Amino acid sequence: SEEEIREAFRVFDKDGNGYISAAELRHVMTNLGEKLTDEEVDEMIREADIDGDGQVNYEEFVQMM
Ligand SMILES: [Ca+2]
Ligand SMILES: [Ca+2]
Fold first, then answer.
1. Which of 34, 35, 37, 56 could in theory staple to 29 by disulfide, Cβ–Cβ 3.0 to 4.6 A?
2. 47 is known to lie in a ligand binding site
3. Strand 56-57 vs strand 19-20: parallel, antiparallel, or unpaired?
4. 42 annotated ligand binder
5. Which stretch of DSSP H or E encloses residue 20?
6. Is residue 19 part of an annotated ligand binding site?
């Protein structure tokens, strides 16, 4: 759906600043029960990080999904 991707981003962007950071991504994964390192989180971000800022914006997130 389109409204589902909008809702998902809103939930992962902990501070609501418009960007999902590595810390935020690591945080949700850890709460779900994943054991991960910052290196693992970085690889995930590299798969979505188009403009190369190290974080995931809304546009990048939707592409990712
Ligand atoms: Ca954020
Ligand atoms: Ca980015």
1. 34
2. no
3. antiparallel
4. no
5. strand 19-20
6. yes
